[PDB]
């Protein structure tokens, strides 16, 4: 295949091949799941001790899938954007604006020869003046706003489960929502417990937080 070495080469059917391959890096990381009700977002992730969930500011964090060194870069970047914002404004970086700028950073790495794609997907979960928000970012620079989804390996199954249940999630409380996020992450698999499964939460009243093994015992 002549058309699949660089990012700066279209193919005769209007495809960018190197970009689809970066996208496989995501389909082959460990599964993560997100879901949201009226006032919280829950991330869960199946650790395959590997940092897979990062806090980006008081009101927002993310799960990754794929190349971790890419995840860490995208984190230094968002953290520095939120801090800047709060220095200038004394309030929280709004979440739609976080998504835009991540999207654009990714896109620049798919259009020049001196930049490599990012081989890492994010589930960004946060909470601001317009409620909770769950964004998915992929290496093509696309940015979806979801009520629920899953990424990474076997994560189709997680996706199927969620598809039957998400309509009920607006009404759920924070405990059923966490359980739905686990039955989903389970569907992508050894079983879940406090040494290989992460849970994080953010919402009204609730700065972004990874549950400790104690608090997580209740759910697991």
């Amino acid at each position: 295949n002549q058309y699949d070495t660089n990012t700066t080469t279209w193919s005769p059917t209007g495809r960018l091949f190197q970009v689809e391959y970066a996208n496989e890096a995501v389909n082959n990381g460990s599964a993560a799941v997100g879901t949201k009700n009226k006032d919280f977002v829950v991330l869960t992730a199946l650790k395959r001790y590997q940092e897979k969930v990062f806090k980006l500011d008081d009101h927002v964090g993310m799960a990754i899938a794929g190349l971790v060194a890419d995840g860490r870069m995208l984190a230094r970047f968002v953290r520095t954007e939120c801090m800047n914002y709060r220095y200038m404004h004394d309030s929280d970086n709004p979440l739609p604006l976080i998504a835009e700028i991540v999207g654009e950073k990714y896109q620049r790495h798919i259009q020049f020869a001196g930049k490599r794609p990012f081989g890492v997907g994010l589930l960004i979960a946060g909470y601001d003046s317009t409620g909770p928000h769950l964004y998915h970012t992929v290496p093509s620079g696309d940015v979806f706003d979801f009520k629920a989804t899953a990424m990474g390996l076997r994560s189709q199954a997680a996706r199927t489960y969620l598809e039957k249940h998400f309509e009920s999630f607006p009404d759920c409380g924070l405990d059923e929502l966490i359980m739905h996020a686990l039955k989903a992450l389970a569907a992508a698999t050894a079983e879940l417990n406090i040494k290989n499964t992460t849970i994080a939460i953010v919402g009204k009243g609730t700065p972004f937080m990874v549950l400790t093994e104690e608090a997580a015992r209740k759910y697991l």
């Binding site: 220095y87 200038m88 404004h89 004394d90 309030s91 709004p94 739609p96 604006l97 835009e100 003046s129 317009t130």
Partner: protein, 218 residues
């Protein structure tokens, strides 16, 4: 070096008033008596400043643009508190380069039925409070607004207007570079409105001001 004189502001029950005159001076020359010095910034907020009018124009332009662009590109409508914070950072930054904004700002607004009022000076000092002022307002007005606010339970809109006008009258009497022509903005119910100019009634007819009593030589 078109320059603005005093600005004053006071909080009352339900909102806040900002007032100034419509004059730009150049040194002692009263050069433009019909300039509207107050600027609406976004949905909830209004600003004014004492000092160098060019530096005020530049700083409010920069701010109004951030506020309008942020709103238009999906990041919502900045609040008084946020506008104020951003202002103070830019004032401070410029001071830190030794290229100061030679103004003193007063900012006012109303969001969530909570009225804002605060001040920023040209080295970046900031404070909020129930009454703020700049220029000879700080020496002449604040003693009166502060006395007025001593009453418990706060001020009605009408009592806030009365005391704003008494301050205006003293500025007009004792501030050289002033004129009897003023506007008042009123932040209340999550929006600001700027009134038409008005004048205050003054007194000039005391017997102790007559020619014979003020004569240096009898």
């Amino acid at each position: 070096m078109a320059s603005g004189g005093s600005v004053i502001g006071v909080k009352y029950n339900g909102g806040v008033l900002l007032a100034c005159d419509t004059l730009l001076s150049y040194g002692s020359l009263a050069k433009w008596p019909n300039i509207p010095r107050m600027k609406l910034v976004g949905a909830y907020t209004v600003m004014c400043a004492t000092g160098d009018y060019a530096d005020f124009q530049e700083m409010t332009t920069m701010i109004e643009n951030h506020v309008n662009r942020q709103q238009m590109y999906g990041g919502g409508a900045l609040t008084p508190n946020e506008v104020f914070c951003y202002l103070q950072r830019h004032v401070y930054h410029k001071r830190s380069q030794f290229e100061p904004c030679l103004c003193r700002f007063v900012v006012a607004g109303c969001h969530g039925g909570e009225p804002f009022l605060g001040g920023v000076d040209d080295v970046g000092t900031r404070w909020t409070d129930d009454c703020v002022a700049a220029g000879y307002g700080a020496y002449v007005a604040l003693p009166l607004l502060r006395q007025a606010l001593e009453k418990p339970g706060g001020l009605t809109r009408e009592e806030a207007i009365r005391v704003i006008k008494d301050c205006l009258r003293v500025l007009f009497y004792r501030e050289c570079r002033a004129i009897n022509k003023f506007q008042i903005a009123d932040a209340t119910s999550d929006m600001v409105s700027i009134g038409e100019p008005f004048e205050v009634e003054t007194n000039w007819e005391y017997d102790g001001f007559c020619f014979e009593k003020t004569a240096i030589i009898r």
